[PDB]
Amino acid sequence: AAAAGQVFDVGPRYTNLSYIGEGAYGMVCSAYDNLNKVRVAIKKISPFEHQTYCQSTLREIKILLRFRHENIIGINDIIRAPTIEQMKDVYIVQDLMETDLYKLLKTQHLSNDHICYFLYQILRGLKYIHSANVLHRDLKPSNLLLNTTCDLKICDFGLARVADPDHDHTGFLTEYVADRWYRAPEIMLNSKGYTKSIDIWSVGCILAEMLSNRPIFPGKHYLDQLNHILGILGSPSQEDLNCIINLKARNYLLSLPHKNKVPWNRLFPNADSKALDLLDKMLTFNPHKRIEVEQALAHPYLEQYYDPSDEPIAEAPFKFDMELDDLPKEKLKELIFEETARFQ
Ligand SMILES: Nc1ncnc2c1ncn2[C@@H]1O[C@H](COP(=O)(O)OP(=O)(O)NP(=O)(O)O)[C@@H](O)[C@H]1O
């Protein structure tokens, strides 16, 4: 059993392992694919102890196996034991991507052309995801992979859900998992994040972060996240408040001192004015007024790339809720076993 740091048993076919990160349920290595003669990425996942780990792992696998898109990371192979009894770990083999936008923004200035092309690819992948009735719900720079030729692939569908706008409403201050800094204001107010508009907010946050190499709304906690948003957008309008019927959320917003909108050109004086027009439309407080993915693709900022015939949609949308919250981990291990069978 070949070792890294732990068992990383991808054995004969996958060799010359190099540690390139850790994280959720396992650890990530690069490896030489002795069959296909390319370096690949391998994610070891060890989730079968914890129901919640098994949910995230089954979601990621089910979604990434169904999706086929140039801007979404695919699964090339899956390594696991031939029996459920022997299966402790699952190895997911993917295209090796040189970096992610998080690592890139820590150290590199992006040209206006790079910002434009990266946003185009994010929205092109997102159009496919949304067309499949799926919400990503955790878009952030670390979940956007890039290779040496600036090809961008969305990854990490662990928090992804089938869209359910009918059942989106909830109380004030309802608990949430996805990264605070990329959470739409309605999450803190009255939304479960079951509508496509929560992904467009996250893209808007990522566009702002590409324009300055700093998170635009770096809240330290839940209400601080809302003060950061309202610090730039200003106090919500009467019309936007009238949309918030939940009294705890409405009265919280009414309690706050009046704030005027800060103009995007003050925050980003060297930005392309078309980029700031699109940023404004993505970071709209009211999710009903917020631009949709297909409208963002058609925005003048993206006119060099925009080609709706080359912006494919999903053949096989997820019609129905993935009924995973109440499956015991033993059922979820069986589903993961069945979902991975095609690679044996
Ligand atoms: N296909 C890939 N190619 C290269 N590096 C990758 C790839 N997928 C993930 N990584 C990196 O491996 C490290 C750990 O992976 P991680 O950031 O956890 O990826 P993820 O797919 O978003 N999964 P996770 O965050 O654990 O739910 C990070 O430095 C990632 O950027």
The CA distances from residue 341 to 50, 55, 136, 240, in Å, are: 22, 18, 25, 49
Nearest CA to ligand 1 atom 16: 23
Closest CA to 71 of 282, 305, 303: 305
Same domain, 91 and 105: no
Same domain, 90 and 69: yes
316 inside domain = no
Rg (CA), the chain: 21
Same domain, 246 and 132: yes
d(CA 245, CA 60): 35
189: helix, strand or coil:
helix
Same domain, 196 and 221: yes
Same domain, 45 and 120: no
Same domain, 133 and 267: yes
159 inside domain = yes
Widest Cα–Cα separation across the chain: 64
d(CA 249, CA 222): 13
d(CA 311, CA 294): 9
Q: Are 154 and 71 in contact (CB under 8 A)?
A: yes
Q: What residue has token string 């295209």?
A: 95
CA 215–ligand 1 middle distance (angstroms): 20
Closest CA to 64 of 8, 106, 125: 125
Same domain, 34 and 106: no
Closest CA to 119 of 196, 199, 207, 214: 207
The residue segments making up the domain with residue 40 are 14-96+325-343
At 20, which CATH number? 3.30.200.20
Q: Is 101 in the pocket of ligand 1 (CB under 6 A)?
A: no
Residue 284: CB partners within 8 Å, gap ≥ 6? 290, 291
| Binding site feature residues for ATP | 20-28, 43
d(CA 16, CA 1): 13
d(CA 186, CA 213): 25
Q: Are 299 and 277 in contact (CB under 8 A)?
A: yes
Pocket test for ligand 1, best of 155, 157, 159 (most atoms within 8 A of CB): 155
* Residue 319, both tokens: 């019609």
Same domain, 218 and 338: no
16 sits in the region (left: phi over 0; alpha: psi -120 to 50; else beta) called left
Same domain, 90 and 210: no
Q: From the alpha carbon of 97, which atom of ligand 1 is closest?
A: 3
Q: Is 11 in the pocket of ligand 1 (CB under 6 A)?
A: no
Same domain, 136 and 267: yes
Q: Taking the alpha carbons of 190, 192, 195, 200 in that order, is the dihedral positive or negative? A: positive
Q: What is the DSSP letter of 342?
A: G
CA 318–ligand 1 middle distance (angstroms): 25
Nearest CA to ligand 1 atom 30: 21
Q: Is 150 in the pocket of ligand 1 (CB under 6 A)?
A: no
* Residue 11, both tokens: 């054995």
Same domain, 104 and 58: no
Same domain, 139 and 53: no
299 inside domain = yes
Q: Is 142 in the pocket of ligand 1 (CB under 6 A)?
A: yes
- Residues making up the chain, counted from first to last: 344
145 inside domain = yes
Tell me which long-range contacts 275-282 makes (C-beta under 8 A, separation of at least 24).
Answer: 275/112, 275/115, 275/116, 275/119, 275/207, 275/211, 275/301, 277/301, 278/119, 278/207, 278/302, 279/204, 279/207, 279/208, 279/211, 282/200, 282/201, 282/203, 282/204, 282/207
At 231, which CATH number? 1.10.510.10
Rounded to 5°, angle at Cα 186 from 184 and 191: 115
8 inside domain = no
Residue 265: CB partners within 8 Å, gap ≥ 6? 271, 273, 276
Q: How far is CA 185 from the centre of its chain?
A: 17
318 inside domain = no
Nearest CA to ligand 1 atom 4: 97
Structural domain total, the chain: 2
Residues marked as catalytic: 138
298 inside domain = yes
Closest CA to 155 of 78, 80, 69, 90: 69
Q: Is 208 in the pocket of ligand 1 (CB under 6 A)?
A: no
5 inside domain = no
Q: From the alpha carbon of 158, which atom of ligand 1 is closest?
A: 27
CA 239–ligand 1 middle distance (angstroms): 41
Q: Are 35 and 13 in contact (CB under 8 A)?
A: yes
